[PDB]
């Protein structure tokens, strides 16, 4: 987990090079485990994870920013990436091709509160599987 | 308590004494009281069953139009006196949390029934039961059925 | 842990354990700066007597200490930097890059742009020393890092803040509770039924 | 003849109604909150009327139709949400 | 001039049993008597009834006869046992109404003021309705129609009679019309109370409908006044659902957290403490 | 004193010097009326003193009239501008005669409390049982009067 | 020093006052009795009786 602490760290910076060099020296393991393929997929969706983060981060962050700051130095490509990031649905950053606009959150909706209760109302569906184990465990002799 | 008996004379004593006849029927519930048992009454002859003339078109009458809620199970009550309630309801659930909690060490590697009988605390596990949590739990969903039903009625 | 049972001004001796009375103080400084940042710390700490005439004791002690009570950043974080510069000198050092400056900013700057809305980057960057350009990119880290709920307009380079209500942040932390404990359960559920 | 269907009393739906200016607007809504027409909240950014009447009148017997099928329509809703509520509740009732 | 009238569940099944005794031979349909009690906070009150065998011709509804001095001598029995029991009302049964009422309550008002009509339902029990009540008022039918009888119906409401509680749970000990067993007890709750608001509002509609037609007499100067305002008040309005989108749903997953959560951990801690007493017993059994 | 006294009417004290300010020059006797306005420095202190009584007034029967009005207008209606009427709306809120709250930069007031969910579910609750308490009474009405009715 | 209810907007020069709902301390509760109640029971009796 050294060379995966690592990769980690590489991963939140968003650098190539320190990354590519460990994996030329301790990347036989991931070879023998079978990631290497996904390793090289991570290597260069690096980018990809932290543009995430940093719109996680940002509310309207300008495309130039982005793109200094993951080493990209292009405006299109920027652009291209927050495209490719928005129409994957795992960040909610837009494009307005003025300068990059991003909406922010808002205020707790209808099913905001209500979709915990959705998503975790299971639990006595937990609670039935649990009783009816005991009914066919509880064998007197 | 409706208790019917029967003077008798000095004569059922003498004679064949119980005037109780012969039959399985004045046993089955028979339970005169102590003073009624010291007393001649009650003991004197028998005592009476009693039986009550539950007929139809009293009875049905009787059940249908007394005890009378009929158009009442429609009430919304979301928040009356619901939201102190809550927080009466979580402060409850609270002390249960500390005596769920002090169980869960007391939890003795004795066969904690030995423990349990010689230090009863009525507890969560043990008498505040999950029954009272299930009433809890079933006062908000009714308050929360009723409150949906009636949304979706009011279009 | 450590300040719940540290402020407790009952030495064994009158200088002795920890090197001195002073220096059991600068530990309890340490402690409470990083333990909270100013709720009624002033009938805390502050009220403490022995606290303040101790504090007349070490000026500048008593000078970050109330710079953060005053909440005036421009001497707070030169003073906050001496505070690190001296924790290096410590063989207490143990938060070297967590929890000498970075957390009790990050309490600074929570206190601060709460109540705070859109509080411009270049302002508050005089408001709380120089550099604004070391200010945004601070601010960027710490957002990163997860603590400072904002967000930052570089368009416009503005700090648009997003401090939950009492009831929308209480609600984050019950689902979040409700992960952790549905993580739970499914773990007991595995231990049962094997 | 709207039940809150249309709870959005606007100016020009006033001048509409009333074929009367705006400043005249405000006198006859407190006339009206007065007698007891409309007592629902008055706007004047949007301004929007909120509609409670509690002085009912002859309703045109003879146009008694949008009443009878506005409860109609009150009936088969509820109706409707009572047989899903119990399609939801075979498993209990059944 | 009472404000409303509040019946007790202590009268109505020995009217009812009044009719069974005194119909064997009385097959007119019409038992006609006095309900007595009281009256002290605009709140009447029956406790005691009394039947009279009663005959009817429907030539004008002008044909009867009653016992009087019979009645006056029960009323007088029951004041000396009673002091506080009075005649508050006289009852007859067929609940279409005739036209002998009139002469009735003017021949009975003797005895109490404000006559007031009760209708007792023997044999309908059509929802839950026991009996009715009805105020005698013909102080001009309205501001400008004609004159008419017009017996309107006060506001009725079953009582709750004290030490009562004890015989009815003895007498029906096989219903239990209480809130046990909760969670399906306020389902039935639910049910009922869909059934009867069905009901009625289906009545009202077709009252609604049979006033389009036209072929009853439209009593509309009392309808529309008291259904206009029913049908604008403003429930259907969602935006105050928007303002209280968490109107109570932080409390429906605070109880999805802390009552299925909770019944899901007590049920496993039962479960695991039984399988361990299963697994030690069938350890160490031999 | 009709006009004046009810009715929430808007009392624009510079109709009123015409419409209702005859006292002042020429009445039946107009002795008091001189005695109070028609004199020079206490008359014009008392005139004042009407001036800012009706524009309280009319800030109060506004205020359970008009939920949102917009600044002109309400400026409008008190016969002042806007900082005068916001001044004057200040002197009412720390008097706590009214609920006001106001945004200074967009210059818009509102009236209402917030709603807590609480009691909006409970108006609503109660809503509700007015509406059954409605059916039923509608039942009992409608089918007694169909009872007479059906009487044929 | 929660003394007042309001957040300064300084982007647009002015204080947004707001009346802070203080009933909700419900959520703080909930969330008390979550910790208490399933931490201190879940961890110790399921890691005591790790076989079962």
Redesign the interface.
């Known amino acids: 987990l050294m060379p995966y602490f690592l990769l980690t760290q590489a991963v939140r910076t968003g650098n190539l090079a320190k990354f590519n060099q460990v994996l030329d020296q301790f990347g036989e393991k991931f070879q023998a485990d079978g990631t290497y393929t996904l390793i090289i997929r991570l290597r260069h969706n690096v980018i990809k994870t932290g543009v995430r983060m940093i719109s996680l981060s940002y509310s309207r962050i300008s495309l130039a920013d982005i793109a200094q700051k993951l080493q990209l130095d292009s405006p299109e490509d920027a652009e291209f990436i927050v495209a490719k990031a928005i129409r994957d649905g795992v960040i909610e950053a837009s494009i307005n091709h003025e300068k990059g606009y991003v909406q922010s959150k808002e205020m707790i909706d209808i099913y905001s509160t209500r979709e915990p209760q959705l998503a975790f109302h299971q639990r006595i569906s937990f609670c039935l599987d649990i009783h009816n184990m005991s009914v066919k465990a509880m064998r007197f002799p | 308590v409706i208790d019917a008996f029967r003077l008798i004379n000095a004569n059922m004593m003498v004679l064949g004494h119980e005037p109780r006849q012969t039959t399985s029927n004045l046993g089955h519930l028979n339970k005169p009281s102590i003073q009624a048992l010291i007393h001649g009454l009650n003991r004197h002859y028998y005592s009476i069953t009693i039986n009550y003339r539950k007929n139809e078109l009293e009875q049905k009458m009787l059940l249908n139009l007394h005890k009378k809620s009929w158009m009442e199970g429609l009430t919304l009550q979301d928040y009356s006196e619901h939201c102190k309630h809550n927080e009466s309801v979580v402060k409850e659930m609270l002390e249960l949390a500390k005596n769920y909690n002090k169980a869960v060490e007391e939890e003795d590697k004795m066969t904690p029934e030995q423990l349990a009988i010689k230090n009863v605390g009525k507890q969560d596990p043990k008498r505040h039961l999950e029954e009272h949590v299930d009433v809890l739990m079933t006062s908000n969903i009714v308050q929360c059925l009723a409150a949906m039903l009636d949304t979706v009625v009011f279009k | 842990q450590a300040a719940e049972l540290f402020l407790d001004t009952v030495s064994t001796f009158t200088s002795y354990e920890l090197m001195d009375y002073k220096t059991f103080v600068t530990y309890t400084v340490y402690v409470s700066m990083i333990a909270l940042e100013?709720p009624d710390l002033r009938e805390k700490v502050i009220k403490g007597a022995e606290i303040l005439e101790v504090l007349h004791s070490l000026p500048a002690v008593r000078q970050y200490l109330f710079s953060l009570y005053e909440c005036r950043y421009s001497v707070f974080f030169q003073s906050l930097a001496v505070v690190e510069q001296e924790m290096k000198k410590d063989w207490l050092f143990a938060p070297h890059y967590r929890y000498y400056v970075r957390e009790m900013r990050i309490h600074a700057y929570s206190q601060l742009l709460e109540?705070?809305?859109?509080?411009?980057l270049g302002?508050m960057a005089e408001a709380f020393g120089v550099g604004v350009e070391f200010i945004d990119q601070e601010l960027?880290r710490f957002?990163?890092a997860g603590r400072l709920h904002c967000?930052?307009?570089?368009?416009?380079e503005?700090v648009?803040?997003?401090?939950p209500?009492?009831?929308?942040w209480?609600?984050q932390?019950?689902?979040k509770?409700?992960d952790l404990?549905?993580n739970?359960?499914q773990?007991?559920?595995r231990?049962?039924?094997? | 003849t709207r039940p809150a269907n249309h709870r959005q009393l606007t100016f020009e739906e006033i001048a509409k109604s009333a074929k009367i200016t705006v400043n005249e607007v405000e006198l006859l809504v407190m006339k009206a909150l007065s007698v007891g027409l409309v007592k629902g909240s008055i706007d004047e950014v949007d301004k929007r009327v909120h509609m409670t009447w509690v002085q009912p009148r002859v309703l045109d017997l003879q146009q008694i139709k949008g009443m009878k099928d506005r409860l109609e329509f009150w009936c088969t809703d509820v109706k409707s949400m009572e047989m899903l509520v119990e399609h939801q509740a075979h498993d209990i009732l059944t | 001039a009472v404000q409303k009238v509040v019946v007790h569940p202590l009268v109505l099944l020995s009217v009812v049993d009044h009719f069974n005794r005194i119909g064997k031979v009385g097959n007119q349909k019409r038992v006609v008597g006095v309900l007595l009690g009281s009256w002290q906070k605009k709140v009447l009150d029956v406790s005691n009834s009394f039947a009279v065998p009663f005959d009817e011709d429907d030539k004008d509804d002008s044909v009867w006869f009653l016992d009087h001095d019979y009645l006056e001598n029960m009323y007088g029995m029951f004041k000396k046992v009673n002091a506080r029991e009075r005649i508050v009302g006289w009852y007859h049964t067929g609940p279409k109404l005739h036209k002998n009422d009139i002469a009735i309550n003017e021949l009975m008002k003797r005895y109490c003021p404000n006559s007031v009509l009760v209708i007792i339902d023997v044999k309908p029990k059509d929802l839950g309705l026991p009996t009715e009540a009805y105020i005698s008022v013909e102080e001009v039918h309205d501001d400008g129609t004609p004159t008419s009888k017009t017996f309107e119906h006060v506001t009725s409401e079953i009582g709750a009679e004290e030490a009562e509680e004890v015989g009815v749970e003895h007498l029906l000990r096989d219903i239990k019309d209480t809130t046990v067993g909760t969670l399906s007890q306020r389902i039935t709750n639910q049910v009922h109370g869909l059934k009867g608001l069905n009901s009625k509002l289906l009545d009202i509609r077709s009252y609604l409908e049979k006033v389009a037609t036209g072929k009853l007499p439209i009593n509309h100067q009392i309808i529309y006044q008291l259904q206009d305002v029913f049908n604008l008040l403003p429930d259907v309005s969602l935006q105050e659902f928007v303002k209280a989108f968490y109107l109570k749903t932080n409390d429906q997953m605070v109880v999805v957290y802390l009552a299925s959560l909770i019944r899901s951990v007590v049920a496993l801690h039962n479960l695991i403490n039984n399988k361990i007493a299963n697994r030690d017993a069938e350890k160490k059994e031999g | 004193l009709l006009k004046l006294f009810t009715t929430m009417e808007l009392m624009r004290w510079s109709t009123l010097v015409e419409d209702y300010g005859m006292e002042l020059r020429k009445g039946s006797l107009e002795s008091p009326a001189t005695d109070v306005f028609g004199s020079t420095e206490e008359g014009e202190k008392r005139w004042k003193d009407l001036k800012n009584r009706v524009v309280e007034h009319n800030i109060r029967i506004m205020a359970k009239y008009y939920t949102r009005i917009t600044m002109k207008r309400m400026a409008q209606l008190l016969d002042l501008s806007v900082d005068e009427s916001e001044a004057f709306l200040s002197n009412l809120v720390v008097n706590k005669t009214i609920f006001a709250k106001v945004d200074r930069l967009a210059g818009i007031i509102n009236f209402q409390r917030p709603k807590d969910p609480n009691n909006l579910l409970n108006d609503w609750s109660q809503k509700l049982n007015s509406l059954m308490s409605l059916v039923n009474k509608t039942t009992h009405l409608i089918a007694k009067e169909e009872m007479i009715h059906n009487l044929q | 020093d929660k003394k007042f209810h309001g957040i300064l907007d300084q982007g647009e020069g002015v204080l947004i006052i707001f009346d802070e709902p203080p009933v909700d301390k419900t959520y703080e509760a909930a969330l008390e009795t979550i910790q208490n109640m399933s931490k201190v029971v879940d961890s110790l009796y399921n890691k005591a009786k790790k076989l079962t």
């Open positions: 100013r109540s705070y809305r859109s509080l411009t302002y960027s957002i990163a967000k930052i307009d570089k368009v416009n503005i648009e803040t997003n401090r209500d009492s009831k929308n209480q609600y932390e019950t689902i509770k409700g404990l549905l739970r359960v773990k007991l559920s231990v049962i039924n094997m």
